[PDB]
PDB file of all heavy atoms in Angstrom:
ATOM      1  N   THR A1147      31.486 -20.115  -3.538  1.00  2.00           N
ATOM      2  CA  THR A1147      32.830 -19.654  -3.495  1.00  2.00           C
ATOM      3  C   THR A1147      33.343 -19.761  -2.050  1.00  2.00           C
ATOM      4  O   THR A1147      32.623 -20.009  -1.116  1.00  2.00           O
ATOM      5  CB  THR A1147      32.959 -18.253  -4.001  1.00  2.00           C
ATOM      6  OG1 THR A1147      31.983 -17.409  -3.361  1.00  2.00           O
ATOM      7  CG2 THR A1147      32.684 -18.220  -5.536  1.00  2.00           C
ATOM      8  N   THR A1148      34.663 -19.525  -1.958  1.00  2.00           N
ATOM      9  CA  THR A1148      35.322 -19.547  -0.643  1.00  2.00           C
ATOM     10  C   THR A1148      35.197 -18.231   0.138  1.00  2.00           C
ATOM     11  O   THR A1148      35.577 -18.189   1.305  1.00  2.00           O
ATOM     12  CB  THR A1148      36.810 -19.887  -0.788  1.00  2.00           C
ATOM     13  OG1 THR A1148      37.371 -19.047  -1.818  1.00  2.00           O
ATOM     14  CG2 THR A1148      36.997 -21.332  -1.213  1.00  2.00           C
ATOM     15  N   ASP A1149      34.685 -17.217  -0.483  1.00  2.00           N
ATOM     16  CA  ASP A1149      34.458 -15.922   0.186  1.00  2.00           C
ATOM     17  C   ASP A1149      33.245 -15.888   1.098  1.00  2.00           C
ATOM     18  O   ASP A1149      33.169 -15.064   1.976  1.00  2.00           O
ATOM     19  CB  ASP A1149      34.439 -14.793  -0.817  1.00  2.00           C
ATOM     20  CG  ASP A1149      35.638 -14.662  -1.683  1.00  2.00           C
ATOM     21  OD1 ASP A1149      36.532 -15.537  -1.550  1.00  2.00           O
ATOM     22  OD2 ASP A1149      35.772 -13.706  -2.432  1.00  2.00           O
ATOM     23  N   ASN A1150      32.272 -16.762   0.825  1.00  2.00           N
ATOM     24  CA  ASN A1150      31.014 -16.815   1.635  1.00  2.00           C
ATOM     25  C   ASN A1150      31.047 -17.951   2.620  1.00  2.00           C
ATOM     26  O   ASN A1150      30.118 -18.031   3.451  1.00  2.00           O
ATOM     27  CB  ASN A1150      29.835 -16.870   0.698  1.00  2.00           C
ATOM     28  CG  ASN A1150      29.630 -15.637  -0.100  1.00  2.00           C
ATOM     29  OD1 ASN A1150      30.491 -14.777  -0.166  1.00  2.00           O
ATOM     30  ND2 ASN A1150      28.523 -15.530  -0.823  1.00  2.00           N
ATOM     31  N   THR A1151      31.987 -18.892   2.514  1.00  2.00           N
ATOM     32  CA  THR A1151      32.028 -20.039   3.399  1.00  2.00           C
ATOM     33  C   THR A1151      33.375 -20.063   4.115  1.00  2.00           C
ATOM     34  O   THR A1151      34.346 -19.466   3.664  1.00  2.00           O
ATOM     35  CB  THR A1151      31.853 -21.362   2.645  1.00  2.00           C
ATOM     36  OG1 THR A1151      32.900 -21.479   1.675  1.00  2.00           O
ATOM     37  CG2 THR A1151      30.478 -21.390   1.951  1.00  2.00           C
ATOM     38  N   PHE A1152      33.411 -20.767   5.300  1.00  2.00           N
ATOM     39  CA  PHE A1152      34.624 -20.873   6.066  1.00  2.00           C
ATOM     40  C   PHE A1152      34.828 -22.331   6.463  1.00  2.00           C
ATOM     41  O   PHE A1152      33.902 -23.128   6.554  1.00  2.00           O
ATOM     42  CB  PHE A1152      34.547 -20.032   7.373  1.00  2.00           C
ATOM     43  CG  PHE A1152      33.472 -20.454   8.348  1.00  2.00           C
ATOM     44  CD1 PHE A1152      33.799 -21.261   9.389  1.00  2.00           C
ATOM     45  CD2 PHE A1152      32.159 -20.014   8.198  1.00  2.00           C
ATOM     46  CE1 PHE A1152      32.835 -21.683  10.278  1.00  2.00           C
ATOM     47  CE2 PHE A1152      31.193 -20.422   9.058  1.00  2.00           C
ATOM     48  CZ  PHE A1152      31.523 -21.258  10.136  1.00  2.00           C
ATOM     49  N   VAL A1153      36.142 -22.701   6.628  1.00  2.00           N
ATOM     50  CA  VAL A1153      36.514 -24.006   6.994  1.00  2.00           C
ATOM     51  C   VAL A1153      36.707 -24.126   8.480  1.00  2.00           C
ATOM     52  O   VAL A1153      37.389 -23.284   9.091  1.00  2.00           O
ATOM     53  CB  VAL A1153      37.774 -24.444   6.268  1.00  2.00           C
ATOM     54  CG1 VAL A1153      38.225 -25.801   6.699  1.00  2.00           C
ATOM     55  CG2 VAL A1153      37.606 -24.397   4.753  1.00  2.00           C
ATOM     56  N   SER A1154      36.008 -25.059   9.135  1.00  2.00           N
ATOM     57  CA  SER A1154      36.124 -25.260  10.591  1.00  2.00           C
ATOM     58  C   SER A1154      35.952 -26.764  10.881  1.00  2.00           C
ATOM     59  O   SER A1154      34.901 -27.287  11.244  1.00  2.00           O
ATOM     60  CB  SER A1154      35.043 -24.458  11.317  1.00  2.00           C
ATOM     61  OG  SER A1154      35.072 -24.719  12.718  1.00  2.00           O
ATOM     62  N   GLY A1155      37.066 -27.471  10.707  1.00  2.00           N
ATOM     63  CA  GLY A1155      37.093 -28.898  10.893  1.00  2.00           C
ATOM     64  C   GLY A1155      37.319 -29.704   9.655  1.00  2.00           C
ATOM     65  O   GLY A1155      37.611 -29.112   8.584  1.00  2.00           O
ATOM     66  N   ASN A1156      37.182 -30.988   9.788  1.00  2.00           N
ATOM     67  CA  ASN A1156      37.352 -31.936   8.659  1.00  2.00           C
ATOM     68  C   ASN A1156      35.989 -32.331   8.100  1.00  2.00           C
ATOM     69  O   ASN A1156      34.971 -31.709   8.417  1.00  2.00           O
ATOM     70  CB  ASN A1156      38.186 -33.113   9.052  1.00  2.00           C
ATOM     71  CG  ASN A1156      37.738 -33.718  10.413  1.00  2.00           C
ATOM     72  OD1 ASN A1156      36.832 -33.206  11.042  1.00  2.00           O
ATOM     73  ND2 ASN A1156      38.390 -34.826  10.787  1.00  2.00           N
ATOM     74  N   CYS A1157      35.965 -33.367   7.292  1.00  2.00           N
ATOM     75  CA  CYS A1157      34.717 -33.868   6.723  1.00  2.00           C
ATOM     76  C   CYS A1157      34.129 -35.042   7.502  1.00  2.00           C
ATOM     77  O   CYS A1157      32.899 -35.228   7.492  1.00  2.00           O
ATOM     78  CB  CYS A1157      34.908 -34.295   5.252  1.00  2.00           C
ATOM     79  SG  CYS A1157      35.166 -32.893   4.143  1.00  2.00           S
ATOM     80  N   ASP A1158      34.969 -35.804   8.189  1.00  2.00           N
ATOM     81  CA  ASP A1158      34.483 -36.953   9.010  1.00  2.00           C
ATOM     82  C   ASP A1158      34.161 -36.540  10.440  1.00  2.00           C
ATOM     83  O   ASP A1158      34.747 -37.054  11.370  1.00  2.00           O
ATOM     84  CB  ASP A1158      35.502 -38.094   8.930  1.00  2.00           C
ATOM     85  CG  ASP A1158      35.507 -38.773   7.571  1.00  2.00           C
ATOM     86  OD1 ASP A1158      34.893 -38.242   6.639  1.00  2.00           O
ATOM     87  OD2 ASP A1158      36.231 -39.841   7.462  1.00  2.00           O
TER      88      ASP A1158
END
Side-chain angles (χ1 to χ4, degrees):
Chain A
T1147 51
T1148 48
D1149 299 8
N1150 295 8
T1151 61
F1152 66 96
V1153 177
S1154 177
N1156 47 357
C1157 288
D1158 287 9

